[PDB]
UniProtKB/Swiss-Prot annotation, chain B:
PANTHER family: CHLOROPLAST 50S RIBOSOMAL PROTEIN L22-RELATED, LARGE RIBOSOMAL SUBUNIT PROTEIN UL22M
Functional summary from the UniProt entry: This protein binds specifically to 23S rRNA; its binding is stimulated by other ribosomal proteins, e.g. L4, L17, and L20. It is important during the early stages of 50S assembly. It makes multiple contacts with different domains of the 23S rRNA in the assembled 50S subunit and ribosome. The globular domain of the protein is one of the proteins that surrounds the polypeptide exit tunnel on the outside of the subunit, while an extended beta-hairpin is found that penetrates into the center of the 70S ribosome. This extension seems to form part of the wall of the exit tunnel. Deleting residues 82 to 84 (the equivalent deletion in E.coli renders cells resistant to erythromycin) would probably cause the tip of the hairpin to penetrate into the tunnel.
Family: Belongs to the universal ribosomal protein uL22 family.
Record text on subunit structure and interactions: Part of the 50S ribosomal subunit.
Ranges in coiled-coil conformation: none
The protein, known as: Large ribosomal subunit protein uL22
GO MF annotation: an example: structural constituent of ribosome
Keywords, sorted A to Z: Ribonucleoprotein, Ribosomal protein, RNA-binding, rRNA-binding
GO biological process: translation
Pfam families membership: Ribosomal_L22
Keyword Ribosomal protein: yes
GO cellular component, one term: cytosolic large ribosomal subunit
SUPFAM superfamilies: Ribosomal protein L22
Swiss-Prot record, chain C:
Assembly and interaction partners: Part of the 50S ribosomal subunit. Contacts protein L32.
Molecular-function annotations in GO: structural constituent of ribosome
Family: Belongs to the bacterial ribosomal protein bL17 family.
BP terms from Gene Ontology: translation
Domain of life of the source: Bacteria
Annotated protein name in UniProt: Large ribosomal subunit protein bL17
GO cellular component, one term: cytosolic large ribosomal subunit
Native species: Thermus thermophilus (strain ATCC 27634 / DSM 579 / HB8)
InterPro entries found in the cross-reference section: Ribosomal_bL17, Ribosomal_bL17_sf
Keywords: Ribonucleoprotein, Ribosomal protein
A family per Pfam: Ribosomal_L17
Amino acid sequence: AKHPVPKKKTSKSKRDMRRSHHALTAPNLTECPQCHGKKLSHHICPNCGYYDGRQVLA
Amino acid sequence: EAKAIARYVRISPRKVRLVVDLIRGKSLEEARNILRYTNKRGAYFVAKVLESAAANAVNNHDLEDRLYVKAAYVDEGPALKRVLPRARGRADIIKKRTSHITVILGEK
Amino acid sequence: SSHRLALYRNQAKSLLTHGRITTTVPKAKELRGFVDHLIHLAKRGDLHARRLVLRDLQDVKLVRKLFDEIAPRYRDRQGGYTRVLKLAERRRGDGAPLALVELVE
Amino acid sequence: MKRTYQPNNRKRAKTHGFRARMKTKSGRNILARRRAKGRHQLTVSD
RNA sequence: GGUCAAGAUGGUAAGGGCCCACGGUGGAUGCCUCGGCACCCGAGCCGAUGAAGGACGUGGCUACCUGCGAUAAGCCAGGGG
RNA sequence: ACCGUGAGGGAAAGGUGAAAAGAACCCCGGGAGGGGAGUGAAAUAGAGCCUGAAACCGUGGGCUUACAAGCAGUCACGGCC
RNA sequence: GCGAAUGCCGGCAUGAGUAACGAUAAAGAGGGUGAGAAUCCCUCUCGCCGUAAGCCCAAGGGUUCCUACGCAAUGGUCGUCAGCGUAGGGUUAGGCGGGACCUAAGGUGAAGCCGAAAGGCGUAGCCGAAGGGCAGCCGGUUAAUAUUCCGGCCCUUCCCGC
RNA sequence: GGACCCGGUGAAAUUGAACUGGCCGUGAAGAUGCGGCCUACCCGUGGCAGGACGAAAAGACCCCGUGGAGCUUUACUGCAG
RNA sequence: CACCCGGUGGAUGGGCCGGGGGUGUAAGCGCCGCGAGGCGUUGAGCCGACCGGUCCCAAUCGUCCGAGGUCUUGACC
């Protein structure tokens, strides 16, 4: 039941152009509280446990 | 400068593509946290192909850090021609478009 | 509906037991207030209070355990007996920014 | 759903089976047909 | 040297189009052969002394291919080596 | 092999090298696979590994791109390379 | 000597990172293993069956069953899980079922009867079944078997002797 | 409960090719691509159906081939009985 | 998505707290009847977003990017 389907070879050109507006953007990450290193902006980690309280491990 | 790679790599060439297209030409160590703490799969992978990269060099291609990725790319090939529901009559297979993964690591 | 609850339920349950679990953003954000709320009842502390708290949780051990046990360790404050903390990672395939929450202590 | 496949040892077998084919003119025919002609195995062989 | 008023040119590209260099993907291609095809000279019956054709079967260690079959990669006799 | 209950249909798929000397060992890695060493006339000859073209996906570079129409384009004149 | 036959064969792009996850019987938490676990193991809340989403006999399919290793692809995501890979191992009966007994349909079929040949029919006898007939049951016991292996209790047919 | 935003996977018929605007006119007589004109930046995602004479299928309704196939009777002939 | 207000020198979420609204006097003990129940305590209890207090809780800490002032003519200080 294919009522509507493309009608003209999409054009690489365009095609991609389409796929164009797309793109990524590296994690905004920051740097350790005292953990020293780069963490997920706002969180402890396999480097932390801190923040202000030792709520983790390592 | 040296380089990392690996074909017969199961994964969305495309997806992959975004991968670098980021950490792309940039400080080692640096992105080394991009893919460490970024998201979408590939990463993991991507990471990998950076370590035997940073390695290979220093080890046999030689000045650490001062390094990075003058360039990085991925290619597709080998497919995985995959069979699916017979048009409920005729076959409809997709293709997990295998995936290559090269990437430079030269020193500042 | 019956599910919203259920949750709050077992989560409220399990938690009090440990006092800080690992569910995603929201999930936690709520299990808080509620569970939270519940607390405030262990605080009220009595025939009634208990007859509620339990009403949901369903289980002497705890139910009591908290009302007596913890309750106190809180008799003083003003709600908040919980500190919902987001987390660094994310469950796979998914990619859900889970998070952890505890009884502010 | 009832396709048309439900095999029946007893059945299929019987019905078809070295013998029979044999017993027959026809059957026999093709059979030794198949035989050379092609190689392979045969019904009942199935 | 600052201010207003006008007048014209420029850089900046998310992807994009063409040209170049280097991969990948894909196998065309040439060349090649243990295989066919074709025509000519040789040859022309097997069978209960259960055939042609299979079945299950041994290799020390195993599916297949094989040659045999229970005395199963073989047992005797003569010729070649 | 495979679809057919059956009679029957009926595919695709060959190529490293002079010979393996077929990659001990060390490296990132859960591995595959990638970095060195060694065979070597050459391994972008490297294990479906001779020639290995096109289509098609990439990585950099030149030029070019936001008051603009036509697949095309081709004639003129201009600037960058 | 080829665009070109909705041509044949092979590859390769489309739509497109949108459409789908095969029943709206939901989950969530703690610990454990692992290179890596929403998707595995233990555990605790919770939901769905319940005439089934129960065990059983069959027919069909045939190692798919267990155990130790392993995840390349098949598992429409993962995956240390598998009804996936390799290796080893597993299912024993005088009394259960099939035969060593019986025939209807039907099929065969010495004789007999008719065909251009191949063939047709067809007596008796034979083939032919969860229909007839026939001598047991309960517990234990491994990673798998079990009315068969254990043991306790119950039998049948044939043979030789007296 | 999908649809939408995330992460994992990841098809499908049709399609010469294409950067495809409205107008009023036109041509083979119902044009984004031809003429004149008017609006006109480059891309996208959530949508809404109108046009691309959209997709499906070399019209079944039609006629044309001194095509075919089935039933009919005081059609032609011939056989069975 | 873009768009608006806030980011602990905060009242932004929730929490609590008063307030309203909403359900019709609760759980318990009490007192009447063999029981069923009732009557009381008790307009109780319980309260989902509505109006507003209070730093219990949770918006910590941190990054990145961003100007300089293009060419001619003249009018005035």
